[PDB]
Amino acid sequence: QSKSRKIAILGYRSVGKSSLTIQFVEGQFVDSYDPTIENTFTKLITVNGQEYHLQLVDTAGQDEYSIFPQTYSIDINGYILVYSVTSIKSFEVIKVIHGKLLDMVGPIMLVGNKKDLHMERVISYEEGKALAESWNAAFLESSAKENQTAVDVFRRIILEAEKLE
Ligand SMILES: Nc1nc2c(ncn2[C@@H]2O[C@H](COP(=O)(O)OP(=O)(O)O)[C@@H](O)[C@H]2O)c(=O)[nH]1
Ligand SMILES: [Mg+2]
């Protein structure tokens, strides 16, 4: 009866990929986490009464140039593309990442993290929303400081997978 899913969390460095995943997995907000390592977390969750075992591939992070390794496209059932609402460069980069990803595969969602930082925000909600609409993808904003927003992210990619499945 059980169901395994492997999810890759992509984005520019310091957007909060690790912080988000850890919020969800451990239920606590981390400051000290190293941006170099790739890590793979597990979690169990029930979505519409189906129990999933999630493998969450928190990538180191990438930029305009870096080429996709094969762990970014083999055996992946969902992608979470994260930018930070405080970094325009993170937002330009995530459009690049999304382009490369369609070519390197031939269920993706977009998350604008760090929404709690109202004095540093330089990307509007609607910019993110418009972009994901342009990809035909789900969009959420999140704060790694706020558990429900991180839970909502990872739940959402499963919900997205259930339709596209
Ligand atoms: N205020 C705030 N800080 C965050 C958020 N997400 C990540 N951070 C911080 O931003 C820095 C980079 O986070 P990290 O998860 O390492 O980004 P990664 O490099 O994409 O994994 C760390 O100091 C985090 O504590 C958020 O939603 N809100
Ligand atoms: Mg990290």
Residue numbers in the entry: 3 to 108, 113 to 171
Reproduce, without paraphrasing, sentences from the article in which this PDB structure was first reported.
Growth factor signaling into mTORC1 is regulated by the heterotrimeric TSC complex, which acts as a GTPase-activating protein (GAP) for Ras homolog enriched in brain (Rheb), a GTP-binding protein that is broadly expressed in human and mammalian tissues. Rheb is a monomeric protein with a molecular weight of about 21 kDa. As in the closely related small GTPase Ras, the flexible switch I region of Rheb undergoes a conformational change during nucleotide hydrolysis and exchange, while the switch II region remains largely unchanged. Point mutations in the switch II region of Rheb (Y67A/I69A and I76A/D77A) impair its ability to activate mTORC123, implying that the switch II region is key to Rheb’s function in mTORC1 activation.
Crystal structures of GDP- and GTP-bound Rheb have been reported, and the switch II domain is typically disordered and adopts different conformations. We obtained a 2.05 Å structure of GDP-bound Rheb and replicated the results reported by Yu et al.. 1 was then soaked into the same crystals, whereupon additional electron density was observed in the switch II domain.
